[PDB]
C-alpha cells in the first residue's frame, strides 16, 4: 500500500512522515471508496472474466491446448484457469491496496523460474493476462478501467 511505502521511505531516513506524504495518504484514503468499488466489480465477474479471457487466449494460442502442449487435457486447462483466477485475485489485491506490492510479493517474484520449471510459455501467460485486461475493461467504467489498467499492465510487463 501507499501507506506502507511512505512508512518505509520515512523509516529509511529515520524521520516522521512529511506533510506531502500525509496529504498523499489522505487522498488515498479518500479514493479508497473508488478502489473498493473497482475491486467489487472485478470480484463479482471474476468467473466470467477468467472464462472469456481463457477462451480468447486459447483461440489465439491453440498450441498450449494443442497436443503436446502444457495445457492439453481438461485438468491441465482447469489448472490454467485456476492460475488466471489467481492472477485476477492478485490484481484485485493491487487495486484495493492502491499499489503493486501485493502482486509482486505473491505472484510476480520468481514467476519466470517457476513457469520455466513447469514448462509453461511465459508469453502465453502474459497474453492471458492481457486478455483478462480487455475483458475486465469491457465490463467496467472508463475511469475504473484506466485505474485497473495500471495493475494489469504491470502484471503483463512483469510476465514479458
Amino acid at each position: 500500500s501507499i501507506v506502507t511505502k511512505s512508512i518505509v521511505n520515512a523509516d529509511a531516513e529515520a524521520r516522521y512522515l512529511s506533510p506531502g506524504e500525509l496529504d498523499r495518504i489522505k487522498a488515498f484514503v479518500t479514493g479508497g471508496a473508488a478502489r473498493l468499488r473497482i475491486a467489487e466489480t472485478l470480484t463479482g465477474s471474476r468467473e466470467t472474466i477468467v472464462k472469456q479471457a481463457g477462451d480468447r487466449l486459447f483461440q489465439k494460442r491453440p498450441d498450449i491446448v494443442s497436443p503436446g502442449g502444457n495445457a492439453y487435457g481438461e485438468e491441465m486447462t482447469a489448472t490454467c484457469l485456476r492460475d488466471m483466477d489467481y492472477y485476477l485475485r492478485l490484481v484485485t489485491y493491487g487495486v484495493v491496496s492502491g499499489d503493486v506490492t501485493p502482486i509482486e510479493e505473491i505472484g510476480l517474484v520468481g514467476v519466470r523460474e517457476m513457469y520455466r520449471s513447469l514448462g509453461t510459455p511465459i508469453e502465453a501467460v502474459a497474453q492471458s493476462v492481457r486478455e483478462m485486461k480487455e475483458v475486465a475493461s469491457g465490463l467496467m467504467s472508463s475511469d475504473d478501467a484506466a485505474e485497473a489498467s495500471a495493475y494489469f499492465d504491470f502484471v503483463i510487463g512483469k510476465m514479458s
Binding site: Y16, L17, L22, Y93, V96
Partner: protein, 161 residues
C-alpha cells in the same frame, strides 16, 4: 511490514479467497479512520521531541534510575535511553498510521527484550516511561487518537515486558 490493508489482503490470500464482505468492511473502517490517523501523526511529528521531553521528565527524571547506580546515569546512557524512547514513539506513530502492529513486530521487538536483558536495562522502568509517553501523547492528540496510540504503545510494552 504490514498495514491494515495489507493485513486484510494477506489474511484473505492465505486462504486463497477474494476479499469478502468482512474484508470490505474492515477496509472501509480503516479508510474512515485514515483522516484521524493522519491528523494524529502530524500532531505527534510536530511535538515528538517535547513528548519525549515531558515523558522522561515525569517518569524517569529525579528518580533512582537517573541517579548514580541507576541505568540512566552518565550522559551516554541518558542519550541512549532518550534515543530509545524517541524511536519507540516514532515507530508507534508509524504503526498508528499503518493501522497494524506488525511494524513494531519486526522493527521494534525482535531482539529488543533479550538485548535489554543482556545490557541489564530495566524493563519495568522502560514500560513506565512508555506509559508516560502514552499519556503525554494522548494529552496532545485527544482521547480518540490517544486510544489507538496507547493501544500500540501498550503492545510495545507487552512485547518488551
Amino acid at each position: 511490514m504490514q498495514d491494515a490493508i495489507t493485513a486484510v489482503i494477506n489474511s484473505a490470500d492465505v486462504q486463497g479467497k477474494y476479499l469478502d464482505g468482512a474484508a470490505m468492511d474492515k477496509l472501509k473502517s480503516y479508510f474512515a479512520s485514515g483522516e484521524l490517523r493522519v491528523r494524529a501523526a502530524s500532531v505527534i511529528s510536530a511535538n515528538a521531541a517535547t513528548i519525549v521531553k515531558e515523558a522522561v521528565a515525569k517518569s524517569l527524571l529525579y528518580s533512582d534510575v537517573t541517579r548514580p547506580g541507576g541505568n540512566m546515569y552518565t550522559t551516554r546512557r541518558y542519550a541512549a535511553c532518550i534515543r530509545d524512547l524517541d524511536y519507540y514513539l516514532r515507530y508507534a506513530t508509524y504503526a498508528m498510521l499503518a493501522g497494524d502492529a506488525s511494524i513494531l513486530d519486526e522493527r521494534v521487538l525482535n531482539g529488543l527484550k533479550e538485548t535489554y536483558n543482556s545490557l541489564g536495562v530495566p524493563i519495568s522502568s522502560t514500560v513506565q516511561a512508555i506509559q508516560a509517553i502514552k499519556e503525554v501523547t494522548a494529552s496532545l492528540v485527544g482521547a480518540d487518537a490517544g486510544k489507538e496510540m496507547g493501544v500500540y504503545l501498550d503492545y510495545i510494552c507487552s512485547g518488551l515486558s
